[PDB]
């Protein structure tokens, strides 16, 4: 039975592909890199999808248990999210298939959150100790992804609806998360999910940049400032994060890193803090590269 | 002694009147509908005002008790709020009386919040269990209403001050509310007040649209996205909300619904997501219609 | 051994100097006032710096203890903050020295927050009772100050990064703070730090106005509305704040007051709510004047 969190791997790859895609006109070779990443991401995605279908068929009670858990349910959101990203990738070759995947991912994530998260407002199941970074996945990241993907297909206003849902849900959840981390923190086996704390700002700004045609304005800059603050915090925290050793869970970081890379390209195109953008692009690529090496070593 | 929450009924009606008012030039008959609602709202308001004056005279200790409660005090805010809305209505016939009611409502709500809510920051009276949706009424809804009403009279910058107070107070309160609902939720007899959770975004966007002359921009769209997210959540939660049976408390929903309707008209005028706007207008009207039928049945 | 909080005194003075500086072209004499304040602030700053160096040399374990405390550490942030403000002042005479102080303050505050605040996310040291207004100093005020100071030197985009970090950190911290004040509040000896609750909006809008060349737009007005709401709340709370008597801790208020004054000038220049701006300027000056009188009386 495939661990649901493993969908984090094509996610990272997929998102990195998109970042590279935006560098084509400045640097033709980028296209190749993008294509390669795209294909690899897509491949893994297919595989995992198949594996997950098998899970649904044989290990269904496992799926049901992770679904009902007020903590683990969030990772199921990785499935429509990656679906959408693969859509994005496939758009460069076949827009129709892409659109199909994007609508499936969007409807899927909306249905999922509606059911499960509202259910959380019923009370008594979610605990203070359930306040985990993974909660950003159904609540926030899925909506940003829908916003960017819909923008890709030319549904910009719709995109703005999903973007708004994402951004405000982000601002509404993060306060209690950070208070919780200050007071009880996390057990070590959860510590890698701290990586997800890096994602919101960057994913936010990426989605934002996708909807407003890459215009780097005041909001984008603001979002970047908070993003880099969170990056410095997590960098200083990293030895503590990996106190009990390196693991595959570190793939959490990938989503934020990839988004950082993506947003970096827009900042570069608009000639805004180009040195910072180059540093961000390179740093995120190196880090995800190390994740890939680590992962191959384990395999 | 009149239950203070009953002011929720003219509130709903009043707000719906305003929504219909904005459809006059597109659909002359709307004016009639608006007028009718206006008058009815105004009528009930007068009645309730009179009843409340009587309360002040004879059941004063009851008023004092609801005032001192860290939970029930919030409903008193319904009185200046509805005052203002009646002002809005009456503006179509007599701007001077309207202005009088609007300033009375504005000063009243500001005084009320200053005294009572700051007092809450003194500590020791408010409890974790006091974290109720009703708190949005003095903290958030009253300021949005002041903003829109002041905008009506041409005091736009002042309007922006109240709008800002409302929006930021909203974002500052909602995180702890939603964490609380996730963990302990609410006893059934409070569950109808979940309806108030629908209001902020829509009331926000309505106020915003009133101050910026109905221009549908990026902020308005964002606000709508979060509004509809909350709507879907509450729709899925509705059987749970009315688990112990239908009641008059369901009038909570009305404020959000009416605002949804109101904002829908601006979206329709600006040709933004017109299908969505029509659906929102119709849905909110049908729902408030059902509230009215239910209410007459009880009477 | 100098109490670290004493850096609040030149801070206030420094910030007030800057406010007066902006009134020169409208009122030549303002320049003199500004200059005087500047010099005085600078003088005290030097003194305190020297004293603090001595602290580092002889009472180091005291410094270490305040550093490790999840409550008292925040006041150390007053040192880079005031450093920057003195930079601002000195800019009118010598831009190079100013730039040196500004970069020292900026790097210092960033390093400080990175280390200490991230460390807080490690868990187990910070308690619910550690949720104090003073936390705004490293998390929020330092970044706003960096943003405005950097804007002064012409690094506007960089300024936007720090501004964004500040604003979003503000919105992310305040919800749990205000819930905490509602439930357990503060012991009397901490109550003066309630003054810091006045600062964020005003400091925010000041920084914002510095980066966007004094243009009073919708964001600025919004920020002001919330600022004045918090002012009214604190005014009503003031007798409770000083229940156990007047003290030097009241210098907390100064930062907010000075910023109010500063932002007032921009509002005055842009002809936006000029009556309100005059009232704000005068009120803040009178209040800080009273702080100065009180302080001299104690000396
Ligand atoms: C942003 C991308 C998120 C990275 C996903 C990797 C999360 C690995 O982490 C683990 O995942 C498991 C799910 O399979 C969970 O059951 C565990 O609770 C979690 O710790
Ligand atoms: C989480 C809170 C984020 C605040 C978003 C701030 C948006 C800033 O808004 C800015 O206003 C300017 C007016 O001078 C315009 O010129 C810019 O285009 C606009 O983006
Ligand atoms: C947005 C409009 C709010 C709807 C008001 C209906 C609230 C009904 O609800 C009840 O109201 C009573 C006040 O009379 C309170 O004492 C009760 O606590 C509350 O449950
Ligand atoms: C709660 C946080 C809400 C964030 C509000 C986002 C405001 C978006 O700001 C937008 O900036 C654009 C610049 O491209 C302008 O063109 C738009 O007019 C402006 O509204
Ligand atoms: C915005 C400016 C902040 C005002 C600083 C005055 C704070 C006085 O207050 C005291 O300061 C001491 C630090 O010396 C702390 O140890 C105490 O906890 C605190 O109460
Ligand atoms: C904390 C959340 C703050 C929300 C910031 C709202 C920014 C409002 O954004 C405004 O959009 C307008 C479009 O009509 C533009 O004309 C204004 O310049 C822009 O500032």
JSON list of C-alpha atoms and ligand atoms in Angstrom, two decimals, chain B residues 160 163 167-168 171 208 212 215 217-219, chain C residues 167 171 208 215 217-219 222-223, ligand 6:
[
{"chain": "B", "resi": 160, "resn": "UNK", "atom": "CA", "xyz": [-12.61, 53.95, 4.40]},
{"chain": "B", "resi": 163, "resn": "UNK", "atom": "CA", "xyz": [-14.05, 49.76, 6.44]},
{"chain": "B", "resi": 167, "resn": "UNK", "atom": "CA", "xyz": [-11.72, 44.23, 7.68]},
{"chain": "B", "resi": 168, "resn": "UNK", "atom": "CA", "xyz": [-8.69, 44.01, 9.87]},
{"chain": "B", "resi": 171, "resn": "UNK", "atom": "CA", "xyz": [-9.03, 38.88, 9.90]},
{"chain": "B", "resi": 208, "resn": "UNK", "atom": "CA", "xyz": [-16.17, 47.80, -0.25]},
{"chain": "B", "resi": 212, "resn": "UNK", "atom": "CA", "xyz": [-15.47, 52.43, -4.47]},
{"chain": "B", "resi": 215, "resn": "UNK", "atom": "CA", "xyz": [-15.94, 48.95, -9.25]},
{"chain": "B", "resi": 217, "resn": "UNK", "atom": "CA", "xyz": [-11.52, 44.88, -8.91]},
{"chain": "B", "resi": 218, "resn": "UNK", "atom": "CA", "xyz": [-9.05, 42.27, -7.62]},
{"chain": "B", "resi": 219, "resn": "UNK", "atom": "CA", "xyz": [-9.91, 42.74, -3.94]},
{"chain": "C", "resi": 167, "resn": "UNK", "atom": "CA", "xyz": [2.87, 43.40, 7.83]},
{"chain": "C", "resi": 171, "resn": "UNK", "atom": "CA", "xyz": [-1.46, 39.98, 11.05]},
{"chain": "C", "resi": 208, "resn": "UNK", "atom": "CA", "xyz": [4.20, 52.24, 3.88]},
{"chain": "C", "resi": 215, "resn": "UNK", "atom": "CA", "xyz": [0.91, 58.73, -1.54]},
{"chain": "C", "resi": 217, "resn": "UNK", "atom": "CA", "xyz": [-4.16, 55.53, -1.06]},
{"chain": "C", "resi": 218, "resn": "UNK", "atom": "CA", "xyz": [-6.75, 52.93, -0.02]},
{"chain": "C", "resi": 219, "resn": "UNK", "atom": "CA", "xyz": [-4.33, 50.79, 1.99]},
{"chain": "C", "resi": 222, "resn": "UNK", "atom": "CA", "xyz": [-7.62, 51.23, 5.86]},
{"chain": "C", "resi": 223, "resn": "UNK", "atom": "CA", "xyz": [-4.59, 51.00, 8.12]},
{"chain": "D", "resi": 6, "resn": "LIG", "atom": "C1", "xyz": [-4.95, 43.53, 5.35]},
{"chain": "D", "resi": 6, "resn": "LIG", "atom": "C2", "xyz": [-5.74, 43.57, 4.04]},
{"chain": "D", "resi": 6, "resn": "LIG", "atom": "C3", "xyz": [-5.58, 44.96, 3.42]},
{"chain": "D", "resi": 6, "resn": "LIG", "atom": "C4", "xyz": [-6.27, 45.00, 2.06]},
{"chain": "D", "resi": 6, "resn": "LIG", "atom": "C5", "xyz": [-5.56, 46.05, 1.16]},
{"chain": "D", "resi": 6, "resn": "LIG", "atom": "C6", "xyz": [-6.57, 46.61, 0.14]},
{"chain": "D", "resi": 6, "resn": "LIG", "atom": "C7", "xyz": [-5.86, 47.28, -1.01]},
{"chain": "D", "resi": 6, "resn": "LIG", "atom": "C8", "xyz": [-6.88, 48.04, -1.87]},
{"chain": "D", "resi": 6, "resn": "LIG", "atom": "O1", "xyz": [-6.37, 48.13, -3.16]},
{"chain": "D", "resi": 6, "resn": "LIG", "atom": "C9", "xyz": [-6.75, 49.17, -4.01]},
{"chain": "D", "resi": 6, "resn": "LIG", "atom": "O2", "xyz": [-7.33, 48.66, -5.15]},
{"chain": "D", "resi": 6, "resn": "LIG", "atom": "C10", "xyz": [-7.85, 49.71, -5.92]},
{"chain": "D", "resi": 6, "resn": "LIG", "atom": "C11", "xyz": [-8.58, 49.14, -7.09]},
{"chain": "D", "resi": 6, "resn": "LIG", "atom": "O3", "xyz": [-9.81, 49.76, -7.17]},
{"chain": "D", "resi": 6, "resn": "LIG", "atom": "C12", "xyz": [-6.79, 50.65, -6.43]},
{"chain": "D", "resi": 6, "resn": "LIG", "atom": "O4", "xyz": [-7.39, 51.71, -7.13]},
{"chain": "D", "resi": 6, "resn": "LIG", "atom": "C13", "xyz": [-6.00, 51.15, -5.27]},
{"chain": "D", "resi": 6, "resn": "LIG", "atom": "O5", "xyz": [-4.91, 51.88, -5.69]},
{"chain": "D", "resi": 6, "resn": "LIG", "atom": "C14", "xyz": [-5.54, 49.96, -4.45]},
{"chain": "D", "resi": 6, "resn": "LIG", "atom": "O6", "xyz": [-4.84, 50.38, -3.36]}
]
